[PDB]
């Protein structure tokens, strides 16, 4: 059986982690199923997760899902010739728990403006969630960094870029989600070029 | 209508619900709440329903949840301090509804919700209530505010 | 009998909720003012014997109505209820936005920073909380005194064909067009435009 199972989030998505049994052969399988805190009877089997051996499995979106309440997932090992035990994970509140990944960048220099959108792959099945991006701008060698106010998504931020060129300018961009907690996100990796 | 600013609650609200769900669902851990049918349990979304129709089903709901917890905090006091924000914030929310709204799915829903009090134990029926809040008031509460926007 | 509070208000700016009464005269002692919110149905009670003639109410919820009460009391003695009303949502003061302007040749660009709650997190901010929530912005050449009005869609604007080497005053303020409810201008800001 897998010794350390972990039901976490990131990227708006949920994983369930394990690692493989001690004694466990090369040959190793493994079996996924989840349940829901309403319904603590049904144990629903993650079909596309059925059989995998990486030791990794997605449980963002499957039948009868509910995001609204916590839910929890267990793990098998299943031998060619025996079955182990299910191991369950803990309990994980989508709407309190989700782990918000950076949002991509989408840079469009106007006359002495630059503008900066916020896009997401967020997943088709994502509860409507509240996403706010906040814009760090800098220049290379110096550590100066303006730190713009948090934009809701779906609009852009506009920077005033001055009349000077050939100049090295960066920018970064982190999401923040407010359900009931400020949860934020690491920084996007800096994506910059020469302006104008 | 002003229920548009419904769309999104204030964080300090959602944590309020927070605590009060999280309160009801320890109490619910020890009563015995097994339903004759998954009344709450809603198969279609307010989605599939028509615009005009979303506010009538969510009122439906909203005075079921709300007719429910009033009762579970009247009868438990240590559920009544902390169920009472929620409370007054679910009664306003549904007063803004009913002051919004001047066979199919819909009919079956509006009688299988009246008939549900009648019929089933309180303990089911709160657990019910409980565990469809955040279902209310961030998927429902959000596409009827929503208007013609969601879809 | 003792007095009850005279002059009982609610000072709510950017949902900052302060319930505020003037101390009657006593020369019995000082007086000690207790306040309650009605809350669902029953009133519970903060700023208990509170020395001081000022109560936070800020922790109220921010949807529907409230009704407070406040209350003067020496040792057994109490005052008589004080009861007003309280709506968060249109009774609230919406404070001025945050000014950012910068000079750029002929031209200003100005970035509004949307008025904070502090019960809030800095994501839920007074644009948030109304979402028909407009900026206004206000420029006048000095001296003239003749305000030019524009509406920006969003938190950043550009004005442009400025005369030269001439310095003009700028204030912003947020709008609700839905409910006609404007909030208080920002502090005019003044800066020259040169070449
Ligand atoms: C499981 O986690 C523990 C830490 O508590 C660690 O010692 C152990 O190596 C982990 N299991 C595997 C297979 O790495
Ligand atoms: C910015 O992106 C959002 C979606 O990510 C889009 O709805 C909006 O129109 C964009 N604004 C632009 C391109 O100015």
Known sequence: ?196 | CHIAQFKSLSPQELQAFKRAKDALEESLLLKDCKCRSRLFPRTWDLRQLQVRERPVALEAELALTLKVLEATADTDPALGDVLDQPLHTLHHILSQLRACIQRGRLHHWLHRLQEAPKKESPGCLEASVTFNLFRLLTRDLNCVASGDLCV | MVPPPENVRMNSVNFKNILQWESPAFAKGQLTFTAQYLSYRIFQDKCMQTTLTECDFSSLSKYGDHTLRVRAEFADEHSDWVQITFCPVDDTIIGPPGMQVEVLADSLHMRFLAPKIENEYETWTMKDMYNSWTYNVQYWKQGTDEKFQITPQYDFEVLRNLEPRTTYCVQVRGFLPDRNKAGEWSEPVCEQTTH
């Open chain 1, 1 to 196: 059986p897998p010794q350390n199972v972990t039901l976490l989030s990131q990227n708006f998505s949920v994983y369930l982690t394990w690692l493989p049994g001690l004694g466990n052969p090369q040959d190793v399988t493994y079996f996924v199923a989840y349940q829901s805190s309403p319904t603590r009877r049904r144990w629903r089997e993650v079909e596309e997760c059925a059989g995998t051996k990486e030791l990794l499995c997605s449980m963002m979106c499957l039948k009868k899902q509910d995001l609204y309440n916590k839910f929890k997932g267990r793990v098998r090992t299943v031998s060619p010739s025996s079955k182990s035990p299910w191991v369950e994970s803990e309990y994980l509140d989508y709407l309190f728990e989700v782990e918000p990944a950076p949002p991509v960048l989408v840079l469009t220099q106007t006359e002495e403006i630059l503008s900066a959108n916020a896009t997401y792959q967020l997943p088709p099945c994502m509860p409507p969630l509240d996403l706010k991006y906040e814009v760090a701008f800098w220049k290379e060698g110096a550590g100066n960094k303006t730190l713009f106010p948090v934009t809701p998504h779906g609009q852009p931020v506009q920077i005033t870029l001055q009349p000077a060129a050939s100049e090295h300018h960066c920018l970064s961009a982190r999401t923040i989600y407010t359900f009931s907690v400020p949860k934020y996100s690491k920084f996007s990796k800096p994506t910059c070029f020469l302006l104008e």
